[PDB]
PDB file of C-alpha atoms in Angstrom:
ATOM      1  CA  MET A   5       0.091  13.063  -3.008  1.00 27.98           C
ATOM      2  CA  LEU A   6       0.508  15.111   0.226  1.00 24.49           C
ATOM      3  CA  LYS A   7       0.110  18.832   0.853  1.00 23.49           C
ATOM      4  CA  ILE A   8       3.071  19.665   3.103  1.00 22.00           C
ATOM      5  CA  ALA A   9       3.556  23.108   4.714  1.00 24.11           C
ATOM      6  CA  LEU A  10       7.121  23.701   5.818  1.00 24.91           C
ATOM      7  CA  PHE A  11       8.732  26.372   8.059  1.00 23.28           C
ATOM      8  CA  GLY A  12      12.498  26.967   7.721  1.00 22.46           C
ATOM      9  CA  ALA A  13      12.557  25.928   4.033  1.00 24.13           C
ATOM     10  CA  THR A  14      15.583  28.102   3.021  1.00 22.94           C
ATOM     11  CA  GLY A  15      17.865  26.453   5.570  1.00 23.12           C
ATOM     12  CA  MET A  16      20.553  23.892   4.868  1.00 24.01           C
ATOM     13  CA  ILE A  17      18.242  21.159   6.267  1.00 24.79           C
ATOM     14  CA  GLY A  18      14.960  22.746   5.272  1.00 24.66           C
ATOM     15  CA  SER A  19      15.819  23.361   1.593  1.00 25.23           C
ATOM     16  CA  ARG A  20      16.746  19.641   1.258  1.00 28.07           C
ATOM     17  CA  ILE A  21      13.499  18.580   2.851  1.00 27.47           C
ATOM     18  CA  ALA A  22      11.484  20.788   0.464  1.00 26.07           C
ATOM     19  CA  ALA A  23      13.337  19.489  -2.599  1.00 25.42           C
ATOM     20  CA  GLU A  24      13.071  15.850  -1.434  1.00 28.03           C
ATOM     21  CA  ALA A  25       9.321  16.226  -1.001  1.00 27.32           C
ATOM     22  CA  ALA A  26       8.816  18.120  -4.330  1.00 23.82           C
ATOM     23  CA  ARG A  27      10.790  15.589  -6.383  1.00 25.14           C
ATOM     24  CA  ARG A  28       8.407  12.825  -5.097  1.00 26.47           C
ATOM     25  CA  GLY A  29       5.333  14.728  -6.349  1.00 27.41           C
ATOM     26  CA  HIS A  30       4.225  16.111  -2.950  1.00 27.24           C
ATOM     27  CA  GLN A  31       2.811  19.650  -3.055  1.00 29.84           C
ATOM     28  CA  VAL A  32       5.186  21.750  -0.922  1.00 29.86           C
ATOM     29  CA  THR A  33       4.414  25.205   0.473  1.00 30.73           C
ATOM     30  CA  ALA A  34       7.276  27.135   2.129  1.00 32.88           C
ATOM     31  CA  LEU A  35       5.772  29.240   4.883  1.00 33.07           C
ATOM     32  CA  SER A  36       7.567  32.384   6.201  1.00 33.71           C
ATOM     33  CA  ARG A  37       7.153  35.993   7.484  1.00 33.73           C
ATOM     34  CA  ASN A  38       8.638  37.394   4.214  1.00 35.95           C
ATOM     35  CA  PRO A  39       8.061  34.830   1.442  1.00 36.57           C
ATOM     36  CA  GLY A  43      10.655  28.862  -4.250  1.00 34.66           C
ATOM     37  CA  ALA A  44      11.001  26.541  -7.261  1.00 30.34           C
ATOM     38  CA  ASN A  45       8.860  23.369  -7.546  1.00 30.53           C
ATOM     39  CA  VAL A  46       7.835  24.600  -4.107  1.00 30.48           C
ATOM     40  CA  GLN A  47       5.189  27.264  -3.496  1.00 29.08           C
ATOM     41  CA  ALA A  48       5.438  30.053  -0.920  1.00 27.02           C
ATOM     42  CA  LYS A  49       2.925  31.787   1.355  1.00 24.95           C
ATOM     43  CA  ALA A  50       2.972  34.310   4.200  1.00 24.89           C
ATOM     44  CA  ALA A  51       2.704  32.959   7.715  1.00 26.32           C
ATOM     45  CA  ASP A  52       3.851  34.120  11.118  1.00 31.53           C
ATOM     46  CA  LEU A  53       4.568  31.141  13.293  1.00 33.93           C
ATOM     47  CA  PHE A  54       3.970  33.074  16.521  1.00 36.62           C
ATOM     48  CA  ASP A  55       0.709  34.746  15.412  1.00 36.77           C
ATOM     49  CA  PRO A  56      -2.187  32.425  16.411  1.00 35.51           C
ATOM     50  CA  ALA A  57      -4.551  33.338  13.548  1.00 37.24           C
ATOM     51  CA  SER A  58      -1.696  33.468  11.009  1.00 38.85           C
ATOM     52  CA  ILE A  59      -0.483  29.854  11.286  1.00 38.95           C
ATOM     53  CA  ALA A  60      -3.999  28.350  11.611  1.00 39.43           C
ATOM     54  CA  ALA A  61      -5.079  30.268   8.466  1.00 40.02           C
ATOM     55  CA  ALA A  62      -1.970  29.152   6.483  1.00 40.17           C
ATOM     56  CA  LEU A  63      -2.297  25.485   7.458  1.00 40.78           C
ATOM     57  CA  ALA A  64      -5.901  25.279   6.305  1.00 42.40           C
ATOM     58  CA  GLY A  65      -6.230  22.355   3.909  1.00 43.19           C
ATOM     59  CA  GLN A  66      -2.682  21.059   4.497  1.00 42.60           C
ATOM     60  CA  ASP A  67      -2.065  17.345   5.210  1.00 44.23           C
ATOM     61  CA  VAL A  68       1.168  17.858   7.135  1.00 44.03           C
ATOM     62  CA  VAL A  69       2.932  20.697   8.890  1.00 41.23           C
ATOM     63  CA  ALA A  70       6.752  20.460   9.282  1.00 41.79           C
ATOM     64  CA  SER A  71       9.320  22.696  10.975  1.00 37.19           C
ATOM     65  CA  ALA A  72      12.868  22.490   9.556  1.00 39.73           C
ATOM     66  CA  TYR A  73      14.828  25.100  11.457  1.00 40.66           C
ATOM     67  CA  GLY A  74      18.330  23.657  11.721  1.00 41.82           C
ATOM     68  CA  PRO A  75      21.538  24.678  13.600  1.00 44.47           C
ATOM     69  CA  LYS A  76      21.933  28.094  11.875  1.00 40.61           C
ATOM     70  CA  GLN A  77      18.239  29.054  12.058  1.00 36.82           C
ATOM     71  CA  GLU A  78      17.172  27.901  15.523  1.00 36.20           C
ATOM     72  CA  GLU A  79      17.589  29.866  18.751  1.00 35.66           C
ATOM     73  CA  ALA A  80      17.709  28.118  22.151  1.00 37.00           C
ATOM     74  CA  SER A  81      15.167  30.570  23.628  1.00 33.84           C
ATOM     75  CA  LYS A  82      12.665  29.915  20.799  1.00 33.81           C
ATOM     76  CA  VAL A  83      12.792  26.110  20.278  1.00 34.73           C
ATOM     77  CA  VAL A  84       9.961  25.338  22.805  1.00 39.34           C
ATOM     78  CA  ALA A  85       7.721  28.228  21.585  1.00 35.66           C
ATOM     79  CA  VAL A  86       8.061  26.955  17.987  1.00 35.67           C
ATOM     80  CA  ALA A  87       6.934  23.429  19.005  1.00 34.64           C
ATOM     81  CA  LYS A  88       4.080  24.950  21.077  1.00 36.69           C
ATOM     82  CA  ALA A  89       2.994  27.275  18.272  1.00 41.50           C
ATOM     83  CA  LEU A  90       3.092  24.428  15.759  1.00 41.79           C
ATOM     84  CA  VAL A  91       0.933  22.158  17.914  1.00 40.21           C
ATOM     85  CA  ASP A  92      -1.606  24.946  18.601  1.00 38.80           C
ATOM     86  CA  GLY A  93      -1.766  25.860  14.879  1.00 40.52           C
ATOM     87  CA  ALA A  94      -2.146  22.239  13.796  1.00 39.11           C
ATOM     88  CA  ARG A  95      -4.987  21.696  16.316  1.00 40.36           C
ATOM     89  CA  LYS A  96      -6.751  24.941  15.354  1.00 43.52           C
ATOM     90  CA  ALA A  97      -6.418  24.176  11.629  1.00 43.59           C
ATOM     91  CA  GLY A  98      -7.403  20.455  11.867  1.00 40.13           C
ATOM     92  CA  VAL A  99      -3.992  19.165  10.717  1.00 40.74           C
ATOM     93  CA  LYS A 100      -3.070  15.866  12.332  1.00 41.30           C
ATOM     94  CA  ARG A 101       0.447  15.195  11.058  1.00 46.21           C
ATOM     95  CA  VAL A 102       3.223  17.384  12.547  1.00 46.02           C
ATOM     96  CA  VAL A 103       6.950  16.645  11.969  1.00 43.04           C
ATOM     97  CA  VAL A 104       9.708  18.726  13.611  1.00 44.91           C
ATOM     98  CA  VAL A 105      13.502  18.778  13.364  1.00 45.99           C
ATOM     99  CA  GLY A 106      14.780  17.747  16.803  1.00 45.02           C
ATOM    100  CA  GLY A 107      18.285  17.835  18.359  1.00 46.86           C
ATOM    101  CA  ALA A 108      21.171  15.316  18.451  1.00 45.09           C
ATOM    102  CA  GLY A 109      21.794  16.270  22.117  1.00 45.92           C
ATOM    103  CA  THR A 110      18.426  14.596  23.026  1.00 48.46           C
ATOM    104  CA  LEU A 111      19.463  11.244  21.548  1.00 49.05           C
ATOM    105  CA  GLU A 112      19.228   8.511  24.174  1.00 51.74           C
ATOM    106  CA  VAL A 113      22.539   6.756  24.964  1.00 49.94           C
ATOM    107  CA  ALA A 114      21.120   4.483  27.727  1.00 48.88           C
ATOM    108  CA  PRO A 115      17.709   4.266  29.510  1.00 48.10           C
ATOM    109  CA  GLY A 116      16.941   7.810  30.694  1.00 47.67           C
ATOM    110  CA  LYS A 117      20.382   9.080  29.544  1.00 47.35           C
ATOM    111  CA  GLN A 118      20.804  11.611  26.746  1.00 47.91           C
ATOM    112  CA  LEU A 119      23.847  12.574  24.646  1.00 50.24           C
ATOM    113  CA  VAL A 120      23.938  16.178  26.005  1.00 51.16           C
ATOM    114  CA  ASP A 121      24.731  14.757  29.451  1.00 51.46           C
ATOM    115  CA  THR A 122      27.645  12.531  28.276  1.00 48.97           C
ATOM    116  CA  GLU A 123      31.324  13.122  28.970  1.00 45.56           C
ATOM    117  CA  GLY A 124      32.896  15.286  26.281  1.00 45.02           C
ATOM    118  CA  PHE A 125      29.668  16.666  24.810  1.00 43.57           C
ATOM    119  CA  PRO A 126      30.530  20.075  23.295  1.00 43.24           C
ATOM    120  CA  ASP A 127      29.820  22.984  25.643  1.00 44.01           C
ATOM    121  CA  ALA A 128      28.801  25.169  22.717  1.00 42.14           C
ATOM    122  CA  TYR A 129      25.772  22.973  21.817  1.00 42.07           C
ATOM    123  CA  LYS A 130      24.474  22.447  25.343  1.00 41.00           C
ATOM    124  CA  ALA A 131      21.944  25.327  25.469  1.00 41.93           C
ATOM    125  CA  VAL A 132      20.177  24.281  22.238  1.00 42.48           C
ATOM    126  CA  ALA A 133      20.303  20.603  23.246  1.00 40.62           C
ATOM    127  CA  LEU A 134      18.503  21.477  26.508  1.00 37.63           C
ATOM    128  CA  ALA A 135      15.906  23.553  24.601  1.00 39.10           C
ATOM    129  CA  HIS A 136      15.278  20.524  22.321  1.00 39.83           C
ATOM    130  CA  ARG A 137      14.894  18.363  25.431  1.00 44.31           C
ATOM    131  CA  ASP A 138      12.114  20.657  26.698  1.00 44.83           C
ATOM    132  CA  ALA A 139      10.467  20.845  23.245  1.00 48.84           C
ATOM    133  CA  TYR A 140      10.385  17.026  23.258  1.00 50.03           C
ATOM    134  CA  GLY A 141       9.176  17.132  26.905  1.00 49.45           C
ATOM    135  CA  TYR A 142       6.302  19.372  25.829  1.00 46.21           C
ATOM    136  CA  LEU A 143       5.355  17.207  22.813  1.00 47.20           C
ATOM    137  CA  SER A 144       5.206  14.072  25.058  1.00 48.51           C
ATOM    138  CA  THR A 145       2.116  15.632  26.692  1.00 49.24           C
ATOM    139  CA  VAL A 146       0.403  15.848  23.330  1.00 47.49           C
ATOM    140  CA  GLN A 147      -1.677  12.735  22.685  1.00 46.76           C
ATOM    141  CA  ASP A 148      -4.115  14.025  20.134  1.00 45.91           C
ATOM    142  CA  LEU A 149      -1.778  14.869  17.193  1.00 45.43           C
ATOM    143  CA  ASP A 150       0.479  12.546  15.087  1.00 46.74           C
ATOM    144  CA  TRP A 151       3.702  14.306  15.869  1.00 46.49           C
ATOM    145  CA  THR A 152       7.264  13.125  15.309  1.00 45.66           C
ATOM    146  CA  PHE A 153      10.330  14.724  16.878  1.00 43.43           C
ATOM    147  CA  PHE A 154      12.948  13.878  14.258  1.00 43.88           C
ATOM    148  CA  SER A 155      16.526  14.561  15.544  1.00 43.26           C
ATOM    149  CA  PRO A 156      19.486  14.783  13.169  1.00 43.94           C
ATOM    150  CA  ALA A 157      22.601  12.819  13.913  1.00 46.61           C
ATOM    151  CA  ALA A 158      25.407  14.517  15.934  1.00 46.83           C
ATOM    152  CA  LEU A 159      26.911  15.504  12.667  1.00 45.99           C
ATOM    153  CA  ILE A 160      24.779  16.620   9.736  1.00 44.19           C
ATOM    154  CA  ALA A 161      26.028  18.491   6.667  1.00 45.05           C
ATOM    155  CA  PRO A 162      25.576  18.467   2.858  1.00 45.23           C
ATOM    156  CA  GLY A 163      27.024  15.202   1.564  1.00 47.42           C
ATOM    157  CA  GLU A 164      25.926  12.134  -0.424  1.00 46.74           C
ATOM    158  CA  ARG A 165      22.310  11.343  -1.373  1.00 47.26           C
ATOM    159  CA  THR A 166      22.581   7.539  -0.953  1.00 47.06           C
ATOM    160  CA  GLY A 167      19.174   6.584   0.471  1.00 46.48           C
ATOM    161  CA  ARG A 168      21.066   4.138   2.724  1.00 47.08           C
ATOM    162  CA  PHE A 169      21.041   4.861   6.463  1.00 44.60           C
ATOM    163  CA  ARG A 170      19.731   3.445   9.738  1.00 43.35           C
ATOM    164  CA  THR A 171      16.727   4.814  11.647  1.00 41.04           C
ATOM    165  CA  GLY A 172      15.261   4.254  15.147  1.00 42.49           C
ATOM    166  CA  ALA A 173      13.098   5.839  17.841  1.00 43.13           C
ATOM    167  CA  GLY A 174      15.485   8.555  19.090  1.00 42.38           C
ATOM    168  CA  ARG A 175      18.387   6.498  20.504  1.00 44.47           C
ATOM    169  CA  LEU A 176      21.997   7.246  19.501  1.00 42.33           C
ATOM    170  CA  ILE A 177      23.094   5.343  16.352  1.00 41.56           C
ATOM    171  CA  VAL A 178      26.881   5.100  15.883  1.00 39.02           C
ATOM    172  CA  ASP A 179      29.075   3.367  13.283  1.00 38.10           C
ATOM    173  CA  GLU A 180      31.975   0.980  14.164  1.00 40.63           C
ATOM    174  CA  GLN A 181      34.164   4.038  14.850  1.00 42.00           C
ATOM    175  CA  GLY A 182      31.670   5.784  17.198  1.00 41.80           C
ATOM    176  CA  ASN A 183      30.444   8.427  14.716  1.00 40.30           C
ATOM    177  CA  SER A 184      26.902   9.750  14.595  1.00 39.21           C
ATOM    178  CA  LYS A 185      26.701  11.118  11.065  1.00 39.06           C
ATOM    179  CA  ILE A 186      24.084  11.777   8.396  1.00 37.98           C
ATOM    180  CA  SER A 187      24.252  13.828   5.178  1.00 36.72           C
ATOM    181  CA  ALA A 188      21.603  16.515   4.969  1.00 40.83           C
ATOM    182  CA  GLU A 189      20.283  14.903   1.742  1.00 41.08           C
ATOM    183  CA  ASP A 190      19.952  11.526   3.479  1.00 46.15           C
ATOM    184  CA  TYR A 191      18.347  13.110   6.578  1.00 44.82           C
ATOM    185  CA  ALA A 192      15.824  14.690   4.192  1.00 44.87           C
ATOM    186  CA  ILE A 193      15.118  11.208   2.656  1.00 41.14           C
ATOM    187  CA  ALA A 194      14.463   9.922   6.223  1.00 40.95           C
ATOM    188  CA  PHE A 195      12.346  12.924   7.224  1.00 42.96           C
ATOM    189  CA  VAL A 196      10.089  12.795   4.162  1.00 44.50           C
ATOM    190  CA  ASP A 197       9.869   8.916   4.369  1.00 43.50           C
ATOM    191  CA  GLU A 198       8.606   9.446   7.924  1.00 43.99           C
ATOM    192  CA  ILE A 199       6.015  11.969   6.735  1.00 47.70           C
ATOM    193  CA  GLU A 200       4.704   9.245   4.369  1.00 46.73           C
ATOM    194  CA  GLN A 201       5.161   6.155   6.599  1.00 45.69           C
ATOM    195  CA  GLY A 202       4.401   7.190  10.161  1.00 46.74           C
ATOM    196  CA  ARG A 203       6.835   4.725  11.742  1.00 48.25           C
ATOM    197  CA  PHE A 204       7.451   7.062  14.719  1.00 45.87           C
ATOM    198  CA  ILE A 205       4.043   8.526  15.680  1.00 44.47           C
ATOM    199  CA  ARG A 206       4.297  10.414  18.960  1.00 45.44           C
ATOM    200  CA  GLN A 207       7.922   9.249  19.234  1.00 44.39           C
ATOM    201  CA  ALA A 208      11.382  10.683  18.839  1.00 45.09           C
ATOM    202  CA  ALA A 209      13.050   9.487  15.646  1.00 43.79           C
ATOM    203  CA  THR A 210      16.559   9.772  14.227  1.00 41.72           C
ATOM    204  CA  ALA A 211      18.693   8.631  11.251  1.00 43.09           C
ATOM    205  CA  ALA A 212      22.443   8.004  10.881  1.00 41.33           C
ATOM    206  CA  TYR A 213      24.770   5.711   8.932  1.00 40.61           C
TER     207      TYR A 213
END
């Protein structure tokens, strides 16, 4: 039903997104600099203005699925910026990006990254996600969604049972923010179809 173009498709998160979309009958194209099964593949350089716009031509949705192993703090904003510019130039309205658990709101105006005990090692990327989200909040003319994983996301069970909300922290009775990568992919692709979180942060967790 939808033509989805996806950056970061070989990642732990990205590969699950591509497979989740393919198994539903969406037409998935993995875009990369050096380009794959039920999912097609095409050359595209995210940071080359003409390259992205050309590759997105005719797509319904552009998604970026760089996760914790693929992303770099110093590139997170530029990716968001390059995506938005490409989508505009190509006429693509729906943009969905993997966000950051550190941005999840714990109280009005208070994010997880700023909480007591937040891991030092994830601070730099959490801040970069914060600015990416800050940039996207100025964008009124695209249907973007900044879709943050839970604090803990790894391969696990595909249950299709999880909570979702507009970018606030979701914890279980024990105080855990967890989502399997398969379930996060269910959420992410549901959001592509449903548009529950247009121009909003979004997140999923048990």
